[PDB]
Structure formats: C-alpha cells, structure tokens
C-alpha cells in the first residue's frame, strides 16, 4: 500500500545512514548522520535507539527495523517542521537559497555523491523563477505537490 516513490525515498534515506552499503545501520552510522544534521548524540543514546527496534538483537538496524523506527519517530513532529528542517540542511550558508554547490556538498556529506550535471538538473526540477537556485517557497512547493 506504499507507492514505489515512497519506498524509493525510504531506501534512499536508509542508504544515507548505511554509508558502507553493508546492509545495516550501526551506532556509528546513526551517529554520523545525526552529527551531519547538527545533532550530537551520545553513544549511550545511539545504543538505545538501535535496541528499541533491534528485533533480531544483532546490534544493528536493518531495513525493516529502520522503517519501524522512522514510523514512530516522525509521529512526534509534523510535516511543515520537517520540511523546514530539510531546507535548513540544504541551505548551508542560510542565505535563503539552496545553490547547486550547496546541494552537491550536502548530498556528498550524506553519502550520495552526485555530479555537477546531476545536481544542476535537480535544482532545475524545483526551480520555479529560473534563477538556478531553490528558495524556501520553491522547496515547500516540491515537498507538498
């Protein structure tokens, strides 16, 4: 009952954490991403996070456990706030415009290495006023359409 786009988005999210593509999320990877998002969790908290969904008790999070974790952690915060957070993640210098270089640097930092051509294309997918950049209004439009 999920759309292939949604599944694709969750798989993409999973891969951002699973930077070594070994198939699982470790406390290390969970910590890496969170840190890349302005957070600073302790090892104890990271361990707690995994154990809360580690059904097979192997010390790591697999895809089905990841989705389990996400399903409950995004029910204690609504969309608009999350969308706003993502924008802040992309707009590094916070000048209100997501540039092509910022999009590229950000995704690389999260593990998704993209070419200048690809990133330029992504920007074009959300750009509405054709200035080659994505402002909050355009970003929100993409995330809600």
């Amino acid at each position: 009952q999920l759309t292939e786009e949604q599944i694709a988005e969750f798989k993409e999210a999973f891969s951002l954490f699973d930077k070594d593509g070994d198939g699982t999320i470790t406390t290390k990877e969970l910590g890496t991403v969170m840190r890349s998002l302005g957070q600073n969790p302790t090892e104890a908290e990271l361990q707690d996070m995994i154990n809360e969904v580690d059904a097979d008790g192997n010390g790591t999070i697999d895809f089905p456990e990841f989705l389990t974790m996400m399903a409950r952690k995004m029910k204690d915060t609504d969309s608009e706030e999350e969308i706003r957070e993502a924008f802040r993640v992309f707009d590094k210098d916070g000048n209100g415009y997501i540039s092509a270089a910022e999009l590229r640097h950000v995704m690389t930092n999260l593990g998704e290495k993209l070419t200048d051509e690809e990133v330029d294309e992504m920007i074009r997918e959300a750009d509405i006023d054709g200035d080659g950049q994505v402002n909050y209004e355009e970003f929100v439009q993409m995330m809600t359409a």
């Binding site: 786009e5 993409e12 998002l37 996400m70 992309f90 999260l110 998704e112 970003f139």
Partner: peptide
C-alpha cells in the same frame, strides 16, 4: 532509477526527523 531532487530531499526530510 536516477535520483530526483524530490526523492533525495524527502530522504533528508525523513532522516532529519531523528532530531
């Protein structure tokens, strides 16, 4: 197959909910 901004942005939206 090839990534779109929407897909990638939502991945980040999802990932950022852990904050």
């Amino acid at each position: 197959r090839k990534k779109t901004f929407k897909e990638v942005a939502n991945a980040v939206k999802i990932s950022a909910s852990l904050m």
